[PDB]
């Protein structure tokens, strides 16, 4: 009935000018060495996480129309395996929202 | 660390000109947004207008011409200026902050309005 | 001019409940919805930006979602000091950002 959203998320390292220098692993080749890279970003636009690491606000992402929020889990995590991805599954009962942090 | 203070007359009368003055205490205009808004006594809020560092403006159009904000670097204030004044701008008055981004690194250009004043009354009447 | 329409105007509902308070963009606005809170003797205080990012400081238990028209604030495990009132502002078309009438709690 409901729609579930999937975000996969880039993790960011990090540490006032609102800018906030931070570094993250990138594809691209396929599979490379896992680049470690660093960009500039802008501090209201990273969420932090539970260590100092962050999030951006929004991220590349994927909805479904499942039955059951359980159905949806399968959905994601199965679509996540098709497309290599793998990192921290947490869940909102509000968002309705699945949040994936690579890296 | 942001203080936002303001204070000014509170009651004048109609055809008059409202004058009030918010002074920002533990940062400075750095490419923030200097905003005005109003909640009429039992109404809904209303964005009257905003200032940045460069002098940059804009109003509320749904005021006409009326609403004018200026800017004072020394000081690290800025300031409302209502003309004609007339009942309907019986309001409380708050200055806030509102953060503008960054060209380029940033995803959006308006972030909330995050720092609020601590409020004017302002009534209107003979 | 974008017109914000919040619905359920009252809500002096129990506490520990989940509440959803809505908030509905007469036009498109993407993700440029914020939620402000209103207590007492109190000026707004930002709750919510970029429809879904909690403001630096205020608590996990709130939860903003939403995007293009249909925009949701969204409290569940109430603290004693949460009565107050519960406004929404548009900031994708402007002169006029636009809040809403808010939601009395």
């Known amino acids: 009935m409901t729609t579930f959203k999937l975000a996969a998320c880039v993790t960011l390292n990090c540490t006032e000018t609102r800018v906030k220098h931070c570094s993250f692993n990138i594809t691209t080749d396929v599979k490379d060495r896992k680049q470690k890279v660093n960009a500039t970003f802008y501090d209201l636009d990273i969420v932090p996480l539970s260590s100092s690491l962050y999030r951006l606000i929004s991220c590349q992402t994927t909805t479904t129309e499942a039955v059951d929020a359980a159905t949806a889990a399968k959905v994601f995590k199965q679509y996540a395996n098709d497309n290599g991805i793998d990192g921290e599954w947490t869940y909102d009962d509000a968002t309705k929202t699945f949040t994936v942090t690579e890296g | 660390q942001v203080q936002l203070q303001q204070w000014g007359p509170g009651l004048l009368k109609p055809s008059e000109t409202l004058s009030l003055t918010c002074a920002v205490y533990?940062?400075?205009?750095?490419?923030?947004?200097w905003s005005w808004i109003r909640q009429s006594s039992g109404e809904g809020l209303e964005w009257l207008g905003q200032?940045?560092?460069?002098?940059?403006?804009t109003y509320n159009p749904s005021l006409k011409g009326r609403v004018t904000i200026s800017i004072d670097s020394s000081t690290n204030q800025f300031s409302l200026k209502v003309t004609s004044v007339i009942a309907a701008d019986t309001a409380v008055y708050y200055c806030?902050?509102?953060?503008?981004?960054?060209?380029?690194?940033?995803?959006?250009?308006?972030?909330?309005?995050?720092?609020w004043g601590q409020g004017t009354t302002v009534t209107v009447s003979s | 001019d974008t017109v914000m329409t919040q619905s359920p105007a009252t809500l002096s509902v129990s506490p520990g409940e989940r509440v959803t308070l809505s908030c509905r963009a007469s036009?498109?606005?993407?993700?440029?919805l914020a939620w402000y809170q209103k207590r007492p003797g109190q000026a707004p205080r930002l709750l919510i930006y970029?429809?879904?990012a909690r403001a630096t400081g205020i608590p996990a238990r709130f939860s903003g979602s939403g995007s293009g028209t249909e925009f949701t604030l969204t409290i569940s495990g109430l603290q004693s000091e949460d009565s107050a009132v519960y406004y929404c502002?548009?900031?994708?078309?402007?002169?006029?950002?636009?809040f809403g009438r808010g939601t009395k709690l």
């Open positions: 806030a902050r509102a953060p503008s981004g960054y060209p380029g690194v940033s995803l959006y250009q308006y972030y909330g309005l995050d720092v």
């Open positions: 533990g940062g400075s205009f750095g490419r923030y947004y």
């Open positions: 200032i940045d560092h460069t002098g940059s403006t």
């Open positions: 036009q498109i606005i993407n993700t440029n």
């Open positions: 970029a429809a879904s």
């Open positions: 502002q548009q900031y994708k078309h402007w002169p006029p950002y636009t």
